């Protein structure tokens, strides 16, 4: 069962990353570290948790018996390769990879994946074993298998079976293909969500649509965003299912602000409390704050910040220090006035920015041309 094997990574990250602040989740992982997992990492948590007692007893006792059940159809192929078909038949490891990749530990299961890569040249089972290997890379947070084999998964087996296998290459989102860069590639792959019904991977399709609507905020401001998230049947259906995330979206699309900040705090309640917090969600919270200030600051040339406080919430001095950080950071182009409480904005006309961009690009091109001229003819 390598397709349900992602329970390993799913519940092991549901505890093991928030295990610094998870009490009942330790007890949740207790009946799944022993009862159904791959191998000897069921010990491993004693380096973080207590010494463990009972898992030494049973887990070895089954496993050697499972190794005693690993003769299986290998010897049956030894008495079944007497037929001279291919010097092989679909009885042995090629039909026994479920144990050695489900129960095999990655130090040996990687070799088991290589063993069942020496297999039939059928593209379907090969693509399945590559998706199994990508999930096995996501088991232990290796961050090299999910880099290497994803090129194999997307490009190398791209000769057939397409337009229906492509809903299994959706794992390239949140994986080494899509890191904390929660931007155009990740949101473009997430926006190809033409499905409602579950297909394992991340579980609980509501969590998938919350991830899609979380990456949609950092995706676009409003270039045709109203069609792709607001005006869609299935996304509005699950927004009817999930009320607070719908509040988070509609406090920005309706430009209401204020309560949007409250929704941000609610998003904070699951920004880091999920499994995927080993990279930080600071480049999401700060980006959302800058996005909200950009959509407020547009269509207001001379806005008093006393209006801005009541528009966004509280914190007049908080508004002052936030803009003082963000303007001089480089984004959010305006010029705040400390006296007279005016926040005046300036925007470059589209002849000066284009002039600067032409000058810079032409400078690097003329430098490259002169370097190429110096390479030849001495």
């Amino acid at each position: 069962p390598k397709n349900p094997d992602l329970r390993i990574a799913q519940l092991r990250f549901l505890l093991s990353l928030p295990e610094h602040r998870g009490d009942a989740a330790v007890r949740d992982e207790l009946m799944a570290a022993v009862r159904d997992n791959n191998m000897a990492p069921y010990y491993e948590a004693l380096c973080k948790s207590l010494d463990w007692q009972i898992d030494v007893d049973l887990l070895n006792k089954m496993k050697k018996a499972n190794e005693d059940e690993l003769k299986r159809l290998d010897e049956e192929l030894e008495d079944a390769e007497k037929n001279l078909g291919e010097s092989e038949i679909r009885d042995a490891m090629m039909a026994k990879a479920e144990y050695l990749c489900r129960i095999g530990d990655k130090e040996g299961a990687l070799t088991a994946f290589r063993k069942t890569y020496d297999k039939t040249v059928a593209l379907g089972h090969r693509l399945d074993i590559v998706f199994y290997l990508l999930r096995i890379g996501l088991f232990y947070m290796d961050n090299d298998l999910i880099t290497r084999n994803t090129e194999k998964a997307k490009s190398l087996i791209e000769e057939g079976g397409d337009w229906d296998r492509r809903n299994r290459l959706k794992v390239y989102q949140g994986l080494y293909c899509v890191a904390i860069r929660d931007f155009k590639q990740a949101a473009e792959l997430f926006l190809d969500t033409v499905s409602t019904f579950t297909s394992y991977e991340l579980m609980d399709y509501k969590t998938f649509v919350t991830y899609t609507v979380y990456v949609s905020m950092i995706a676009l401001e409003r270039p045709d965003l109203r069609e792709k998230v607001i005006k869609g049947a299935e996304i509005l259906e699950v927004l009817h299912s999930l009320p607070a995330v719908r509040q988070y979206l509609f406090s920005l699309y309706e430009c209401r602000y204020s309560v949007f900040f409250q929704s941000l705090a609610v998003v904070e309640q699951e920004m880091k409390k999920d499994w995927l917090f080993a990279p930080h969600y600071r480049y999401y919270v700060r980006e959302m704050r800058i996005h909200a200030y950009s959509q407020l600051l547009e269509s207001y040339r001379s806005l008093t910040l006393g209006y801005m406080a009541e528009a966004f919430g509280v914190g007049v001095e908080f508004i002052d220090q936030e803009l003082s950080r963000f303007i001089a950071a480089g984004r959010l182009h305006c010029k705040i006035d400390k006296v007279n409480e005016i926040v005046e904005t300036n925007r470059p006309d589209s002849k000066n920015w284009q002039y600067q961009e032409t000058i810079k690009k032409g400078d690097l091109l003329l430098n490259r041309v002169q370097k190429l001229s110096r390479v030849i003819n001495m």
Binding site: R222, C255, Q295, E298, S299, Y300
Partner: protein
């Protein structure tokens, strides 16, 4: 189903009236627009903000 249709037609006729009244002006006050439309300052202000956005 007249509620959603009437609300939508109300909104489109609102923005059509606001784009109709604003053609002669160049630097009008929002108070004159609010008095001519017989609505409050805040709804007019947020509607023009949504129109620019």
């Amino acid at each position: 189903i007249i509620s959603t249709h009437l609300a939508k037609l109300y909104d489109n006729l609102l923005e059509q009236n606001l784009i109709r009244v604003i053609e002669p002006f160049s630097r009008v006050q929002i108070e004159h627009i609010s008095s001519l439309i017989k609505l409050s300052k805040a709804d007019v202000e947020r509607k023009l903000s949504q129109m620019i956005l």
